Amino acid sequence: AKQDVIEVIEKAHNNELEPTPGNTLRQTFENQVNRILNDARDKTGSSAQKSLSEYNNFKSMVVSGAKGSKINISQVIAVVGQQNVEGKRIPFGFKHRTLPHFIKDDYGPESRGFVENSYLAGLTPTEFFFHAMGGREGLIDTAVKTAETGYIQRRLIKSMESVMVKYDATVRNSINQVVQLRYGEDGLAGESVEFQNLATLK
């Protein structure tokens, strides 16, 4: 995968790369590199998953669905993978560099935040910092979405709070205006319904 990314970089450097419709050359190069590295991550994860025995306890908990996922196993055994900030690779926070340990204009996988180690192998210092950046993104998202989502929740509640099913089976608000002549267009409660198949449709 790293040789593939090197080949794509060499193509871009020699102007042997032409953009695809709907994207600029930078975006096309980024798409190619990200596709290569995602393919590498998925292939390595499949290798790790097939390596597992029936006695593996990660596989036990993932199989039962109790906890974990196959991506977690891949990150613990195979490779942690690409770290993204705002949906893109690690940005050039220095001048044309992600860290002072890299050369300028280095779009390689390790420079831009591809963790080629597993959690058991251990991250290198640059992989450690990039992974901390990616995890900081999740912490910020978790801590910032709450206010907006809670305000949305309160707004929805105050907008619909008094809408109720009446004894004539119509759904009405406090003003007694009719919102639905029957709840859900069918006058049925949502606990008792369930998924089925229409046998004469297909």
Partner 1 sequence: EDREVLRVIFPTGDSKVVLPCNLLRMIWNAQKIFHINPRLPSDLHPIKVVEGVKELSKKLVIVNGDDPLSRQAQENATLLFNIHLRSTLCSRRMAEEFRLS
Partner 2 sequence: HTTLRKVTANTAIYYDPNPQSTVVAEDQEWVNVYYEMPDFDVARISPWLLRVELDRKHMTDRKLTMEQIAEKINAGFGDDLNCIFNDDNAEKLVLRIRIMNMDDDVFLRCIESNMLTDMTLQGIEQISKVYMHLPQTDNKKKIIITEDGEFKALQEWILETDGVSLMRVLSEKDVDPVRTTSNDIVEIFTVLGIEAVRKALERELYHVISFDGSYVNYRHLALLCDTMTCRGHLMAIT
Partner 3 sequence: DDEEETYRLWKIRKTIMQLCHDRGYLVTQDELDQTLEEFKAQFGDKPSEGRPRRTDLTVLVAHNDDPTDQMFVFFPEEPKVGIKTIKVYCQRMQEENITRALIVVQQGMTPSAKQSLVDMAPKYILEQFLQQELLINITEHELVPEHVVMTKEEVTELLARYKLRENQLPRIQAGDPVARYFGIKRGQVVKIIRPSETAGRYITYRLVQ
Residues that bind partner 2 (CB under 8 A): 21-22, 155-156, 159-160, 163, 171, 173, 177-180, 183-186, 188, 190, 193, 202
185 lines the binding site for partner 3 (CB under 8 A): yes
- For residue 114, the surrounding DSSP H or E stretch is strand 114-115
200 lines the binding site for partner 3 (CB under 8 A): no
Residue entry with tokens 């009446």: 166
With H, G, I as helix, E, B as strand and everything else as coil, classify residue 63.
helix
Kindly write out the interface string for residues 111-150 of this chain, putting x where it contacts partner 1 by CB under 8 A and - elsewhere. Answer: ----------------------------------------
Kindly write out the interface string for residues 157-176 of this chain, putting x where it contacts partner 3 by CB under 8 A and - elsewhere. Answer: -----------x-x-x--xx
- The torsion angles phi and psi of 24, rounded to 5 degrees, stand at -80, 165
Distance CA(130)–CA(124), nearest Å, equals 10
> 65: buried, middle or exposed (CB in 10 Å: 19+, 13-18, 0-12)?
exposed
Contact between 123 and 116 under an 8 Å Cβ cutoff? The reply is no
Which chain residues interact with partner 3 by CB under 8 A? 168, 170, 172, 175-182, 184-186, 188, 193
Which chain residues interact with partner 1 by CB under 8 A? 169, 181-182, 185-188, 192-202
